[PDB]
Design a protein around this nucleic acid. Sequence first.
DNA 1: TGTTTAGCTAAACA
DNA 2: TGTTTAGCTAAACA
Lengths: 107, 107, 209, 208
Amino acid sequence: KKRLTESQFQEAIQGLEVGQQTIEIARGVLVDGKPQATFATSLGLTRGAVSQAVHRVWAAFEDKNLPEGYARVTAVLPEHQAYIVRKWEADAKKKQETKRKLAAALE
Amino acid sequence: KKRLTESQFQEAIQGLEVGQQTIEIARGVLVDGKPQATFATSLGLTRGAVSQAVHRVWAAFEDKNLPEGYARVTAVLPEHQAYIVRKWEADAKKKQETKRKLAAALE
Amino acid sequence: SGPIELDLDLIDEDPHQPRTADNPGFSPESIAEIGATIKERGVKSPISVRENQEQPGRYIINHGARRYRGSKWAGKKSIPAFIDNDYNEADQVIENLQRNELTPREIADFIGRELAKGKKKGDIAKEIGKSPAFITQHVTLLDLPEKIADAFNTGRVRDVTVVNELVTAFKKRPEEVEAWLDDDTQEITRGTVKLLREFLDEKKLAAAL
Amino acid sequence: GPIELDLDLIDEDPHQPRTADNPGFSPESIAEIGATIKERGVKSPISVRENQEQPGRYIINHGARRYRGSKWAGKKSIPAFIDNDYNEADQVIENLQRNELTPREIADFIGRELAKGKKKGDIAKEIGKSPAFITQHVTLLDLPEKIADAFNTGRVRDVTVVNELVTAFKKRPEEVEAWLDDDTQEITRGTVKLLREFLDEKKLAAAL
DNA sequence: TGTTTAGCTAAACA
DNA sequence: TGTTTAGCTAAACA
């Protein structure tokens, strides 16, 4: 599934505009590994509410987890610009493999 | 505040998964040029519901109005390549705004 | 032991000179700047003139149009010169080429005029002391597809070798090349063109498979 | 007219503003002008001064290339005239009007004049250029390390772009260095322009 | 008067 | 049992 550690979770909700209950639900599920239905039953919410709550935090996490100096972008582009964006991505994932394999080689 | 011709409207709702009321609201506003508050007052909805209804249909239109080869792409890029991809989108949104006002002017 | 001062009023620019009026070295900045140095320090590179056969007492510039204009703007009556009556059009091309004064268009147009005389690329190359390949590259410019032409004239692309690369690409996949050019923000360079070709090859190969 | 001088009585000026690796002094370059000189002769006579410290010999004011190409053609002599009032700035002017000087050559010439206690004002005057032209080339004398690498490996050659890059780097160095550290990144007026736009978009979302 | 976006339901879906 | 997305509100904002 999707699981986080408490520290990973901490970082995801930092400056996220979300209230108590979403945090409670997400920590329950992502961190403590509790099934979403438990919260649905106990807070009297639809299974869809709970799914949405988990999803907010999980997305937040993926956004903060992108290497610094990088960003997700999404767009609708001419074919030619499509190609370029794809070529950029490849060259970028290579440079991160060299950054990763380098940290790993030093420590 | 922006408008569709009958035929542009029809193309936007073609195969769009939305109910009658959204269609009725959108037609009123985008085709018949009636203000959204009319519908809010008459259907007893918040101004935000009606704004959302209009927005669904308007989006649908912009999606169908793209030239061939255009396509949503997602990537994780170095920040400055992200900027360019965003600049590309803007310049492209402008060209589609010119394409729409021209179809409508031929009609 | 010297050149000789000639009155400017007895000197005329050659109207078949290979540089065109829109040459950047004929810009008001260019001429006013050379006027300035001429006023201060004098003309220290004397110009070459021939005697005008059809109009006794008057001269035609072989080389030195710019000094000649700059001399006027500086307010000079005369200009250092010597006479060389054995100076033809190729000599002019050569001297301008040696100074990197000719635009790609100017060179291509000079080559057009020689072709139009029934001369052969071989001998046009010889007469301006350049390679067959130099001639060929510039010949491409004499008959450019419309959009590539616009790009070249508006100066979006200036390097004759990139223009060559563009035309090859456009001969194979024109509508795509035109879309690429129809984007005002697209810089045209060896590298951007390279990306264009890579893109085209990615399409060709989903065209057959 | 001008007068034929023996080549072996002519020496190049060692303070000439073009340096040995100037592209106009390349073997092709000389071979090409040699070729035209063999065929048609030198039709733009060179300027020399009399060598005060070595009677009967001459020093080139302008025409080093014709002089080399005259040798390559196998000539005894070369058309010339004497102008004994021809200084270093006159050389810079002549070379600038022929676009023969590299940005580095111009910067280094400006370095030498500053080192003599001349002021930008007067260096500008004496080569008939603008104070802004002097400033732009001064930037090249002390470039940040990575911008220097780019300039000397010839990734960027245009003095005005190099200036645009340095300005960017003075305000946001880390970012400018990351940009340069990408081997695929073309450096041009336009790419740099996009870089600046990007940086300005970030400063604002720093205050937002 | 219209926009935005966390948060809720419903209900089709796997 | 969890995901998705039209459709709704609230309520700050434009």
